[PDB]
Design a protein around this nucleic acid. Structure first.
Ligand code: OGA
Ligand code: MN
Length: 265
DNA sequence: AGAATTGCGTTCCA
DNA sequence: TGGAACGCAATTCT
């Protein structure tokens, strides 16, 4: 039916934009049974034909992956928490606020160096699999795009070391604040069988590797990251919260913006 | 001084 | 319903 034709349509855009051939490409529907193991190109869709998930292996040049990896590991070494955020954030507040890390070495490296380059591949990704996602991100405040140097208002930095079951991505969850599907990039170095992203309700395991992109709705599909016994799993999650369009913005950090939010009452 | 706890606040779901 | 949770600390303990 229109199932086989939709894959050829998506592959046509992805191959010509990324300038690479995606062999063994598969496609399913959100109602049907998902693949137990995913190691190649993969798309899932709804009844309308919209893309709910897209996984494109090895889209980032190896030099770019190695360069960002060594810098990420160098910065994270001098950090305490295993998570980092650049751009804006609206968690536990009635407003959007500048992340604390943005002024730090991690947030400066992301916003000034990483994000401007990754934004190009995010642009490649969105123009192929989800046009109305990039159409939404460009309707946001100009300050968000300038602060994060990316279509996505905020970026998550996940540093997953071996035997760290305490990490937030190691626990099954849904990012229930996401308004748009997130774009996920991976770095570091880890095995094919570990550090995969599993969608629990669908019993689907996506074996991600440094250099790959993952695009899916973290707000609808429950997901979790598997443990690694060796290596170092570093992932970047480019997302957009519902509050990025609803909640106001005072161009400041969290606690400082709370004082401003009370004075503007 | 640590550490341990509490605080400000939003949103969810077993 | 009340703990838990992509923040981010100031207060209160040993
Ligand atoms: O890192 C991954 O593969 C998935 N990450 C998340 O679900 C997250 O950061 O919320
Ligand atoms: Mn998530």
């Amino acid at each position: 039916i229109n199932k086989k034709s939709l894959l050829q349509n998506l592959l046509s855009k992805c191959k010509t934009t990324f300038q690479q051939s995606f062999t063994n490409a598969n496609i399913t529907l959100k109602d049907e049974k998902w693949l137990k193991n995913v190691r190649t190109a993969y798309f899932v869709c709804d009844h309308d034909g919209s893309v709910e998930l897209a996984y494109l292996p090895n889209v980032l040049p190896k030099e770019l992956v190695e360069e960002f990896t060594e810098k990420f590991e160098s910065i994270q070494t001098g950090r305490k928490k295993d998570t980092g955020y650049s751009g804006i954030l609206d968690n536990s507040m009635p407003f959007n606020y500048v992340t604390a890390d943005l002024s730090q070495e991690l947030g400066q490296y992301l916003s000034e160096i990483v994000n401007p380059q990754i934004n190009y591949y995010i642009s490649k990704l969105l123009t192929c699999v989800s046009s109305r996602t990039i159409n939404y991100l460009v309707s946001l405040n100009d300050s968000y795009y300038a602060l994060n140097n990316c279509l996505y208002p905020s970026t998550a930095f996940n540093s997953l070391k071996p035997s760290n079951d305490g990490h937030r991505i190691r626990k099954p969850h849904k990012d229930n604040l996401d308004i748009t599907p997130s774009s996920l990039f991976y770095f570091g170095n880890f095995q094919n069988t570990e550090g995969y992203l599993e969608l629990t309700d669908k019993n689907c395991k996506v074996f991600v590797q440094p250099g790959d992109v993952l695009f899916f709705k973290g707000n609808e599909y429950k997901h979790v990251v598997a443990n690694i016994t060796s290596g170092w799993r570093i992932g970047l999650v480019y997302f957009a919260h519902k509050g990025s369009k609803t909640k106001p913005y005072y161009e400041d950090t969290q606690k400082n913006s709370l004082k401003i939010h009370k004075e503007t009452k």
